[PDB]
Amino acid sequence: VVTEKQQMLEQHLQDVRKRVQDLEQKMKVVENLQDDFDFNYKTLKMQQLEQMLTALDQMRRSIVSELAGLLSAMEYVQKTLTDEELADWKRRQQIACIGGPPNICLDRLENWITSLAESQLQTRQQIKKLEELQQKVSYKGDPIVQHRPMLEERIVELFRNLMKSAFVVERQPCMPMHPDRPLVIKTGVQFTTKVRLLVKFPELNYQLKIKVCIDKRGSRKFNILGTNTKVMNMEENGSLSAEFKHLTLREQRCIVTEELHLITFETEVYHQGLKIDLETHSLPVVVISNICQMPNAWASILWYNMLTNNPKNVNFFTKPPIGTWDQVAEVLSWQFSSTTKRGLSIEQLTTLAEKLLGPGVNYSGCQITWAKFCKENMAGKGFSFWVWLDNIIDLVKKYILALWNEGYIMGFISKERERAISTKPPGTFLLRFSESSKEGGVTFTWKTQIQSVEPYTKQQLNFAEIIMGYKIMDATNILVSPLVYLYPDIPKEEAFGKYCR
């Protein structure tokens, strides 16, 4: 969809696109009225020269002040493009990295930037057309001579920046085998990143070679390996980009999941006779040694994005900021909505808000520190909040995926609150995650006292049957049955029978 700030932008842009049509014209007309003058003077080589000149001077004056104003105009819109609607995208990328509401399609921005740069480049060819007359007809008091060096300088500035800013990291660095784990890369593993130049110029095609490096205190300095450089070209929406598939890492030899490193891409550009200094970098990355540090890092990733939107601040954990539950809550939800077709209801999100902050009402302004989140172990438990939860995710994703599809999983529910269930017909059941087991456990629940069996870990799930079998042989020496009706009142057959062989 289009915001109304975007209206103003695609607007601003066509108004400039329009002034370059007018200047386009003015230039043509004045060039002619100056050729008549040249001819009349090379023909008399008496008055319609003394005047023709008083006139040409008034053209120059107008044309030149027309350009000054046109530039003042491009200065404006570029700032609304770059500093506003681009920063906007960059932050929306940040957030879509950690499973947030996506849509970071560089198209709208590419046309706006492409359009603006196309203008600026015609405007440079206008100012050049001026120094053409600064040469065919000049005189003392020549407006051109004392304004064209000026304008040239000015417009070149504008492009130089627009150009630089148009250089981004389209798709952040990420191992193809850990798609959901971007910005966290294991040394020795091969990944794929990708840059894009939002000044889609067909002339530039194939003309740009990008060179990605890596770091250039006390931290571990690494070094990328393989096809270290790539040439930028228009292959796939014919946009200027270079993808670096098959890149590996290693460590320059001779904490860790809290250590950030930046990757830099670079290439110079020479066009219409100019040297441009192009270079962009990726969102801070945590490099790991073993796939065990996978979570503890992905944690840092999330914590960084969720908070600061600063792209260059590796020493983020030099003093990690705080983070009201609200934000955290949302972020957590995403992980589910990202992979699955569901996140966390404010219900499961509460028995979980407390599962962290403990007892209390309304967990909103409730500040959570980095430590708290995962740097610290749960009250009784022998592990941390995050650590525990990461498998609860991987569990849902890998095992019991389409199984969690239609809810079916209360997942998070205070063992206590799990009592008011002391309502339905004896036999109805839940589906929770063991709060005690670090490697993820999916159990179940049934004065008709209540009873939740021993959780079942991943190795076991090697479940639509544990819910169709489990007899719990009885005391009346009768291998009883698996308590029916999912929480609602759904007899475990229309809910469970489908996925059954």
Curated annotation (Swiss-Prot):
Modified residues (Phosphotyrosine): Y456
Gene this protein is translated from: Stat3
Outcome of gene disruption: Early embryonic lethality, day 6.5-7.5. Conditional, tissue specific mutants are variably viable and show diverse defects including obesity, diabetes, thermal dysregulation and infertility.
Ranges in coiled-coil conformation: none
Domain (SH2) ranges: 404-483
Residue window of motif Essential for nuclear import: 15-27
Name of the protein this chain belongs to: Signal transducer and activator of transcription 3
Gene Ontology MF term list: acetylation-dependent protein binding; CCR5 chemokine receptor binding; chromatin DNA binding; DNA binding; DNA-binding transcription activator activity, RNA polymerase II-specific; DNA-binding transcription factor activity; DNA-binding transcription factor activity, RNA polymerase II-specific; DNA-binding transcription factor binding
Family (UniProt): Belongs to the transcription factor STAT family.
Source organism (scientific name): Mus musculus (Mouse)
